[PDB]
């Protein structure tokens, strides 16, 4: 996985990263004289804490295959440390969506979930908790394919209960965040609670409010967004059962 240096043409920024911008280029690789990749810069590397960290998520996305989670192509671990991963050219979902927000129709939002559904399955066969579900973490590789795209201060609005309370993450944790993420893509890309401070998040979830039901979302969705906030973890779906009842859903509308 180490990459030559001079066998990538650093091109434009394309995105703010949680470490350091991301640019696309291009990898001049033997396989492939011009491949298109994404490249992922680290900010302060020079420190062997932030480095570590930074270079943690490339660790993590190596020991997945899955068509709708983006793939590592390799590293540069000398100054300035690169992570170079497949190019998602349609760039971040919530831009995307609030950009696209009059052009895409109800089946393409549905599609999305969905499509997240099916990686986040797959994470949860391999025992894997993410903790850190959300539209901000999503990317376009094509308007019919979005993929997770980030495996690296807290997201309070976005958390369950017990993750703010308790400093605890699961599987049922992340279906919560999931629930939510579902939010975020019906919603064209608004965040959740907006105009409301961190801290008194909990307190609204503790007195049972809920992010209401998105303008256009079919009832069968927003219920199943509702039963992944149960406030009782183990009242939660799986992401089995989310994923088909996400098909059946995602057939149901494009049968309208």
Known sequence: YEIQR????????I????????????????????????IKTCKNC????????????????????????????????????????????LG?????????????????????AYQLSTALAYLESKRFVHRDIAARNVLVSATDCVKLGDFGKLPIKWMAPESINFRRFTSASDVWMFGVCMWEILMHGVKP?????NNDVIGRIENGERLPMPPNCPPTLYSL???????????????????AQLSTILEEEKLQ
């Open 6 to 13: 001079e066998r990538i043409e650093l091109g434009r920024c």
């Open 15 to 38: 995105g703010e990263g949680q470490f350091g911008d991301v640019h696309q280029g291009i990898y001049m690789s033997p396989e492939n004289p011009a491949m298109a990749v994404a």
């Open 46 to 89: 020079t420190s062997d804490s932030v480095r570590e960290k930074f270079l943690q998520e490339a660790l993590t996305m190596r020991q997945f295959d899955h068509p709708h989670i983006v793939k590592l192509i390799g590293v540069i671990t000398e100054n300035p440390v690169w992570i170079i991963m497949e190019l998602c050219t």
């Open 92 to 112: 971040e979902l919530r831009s995307f969506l609030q950009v696209r927000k009059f052009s895409l129709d109800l089946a393409s939002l549905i599609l999305y």
């Open 193 to 197: 609670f907006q105009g409301v401070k």
């Open 225 to 243: 967004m509702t039963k992944c906030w149960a406030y009782d973890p183990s009242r939660r779906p799986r992401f089995t059962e989310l994923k």
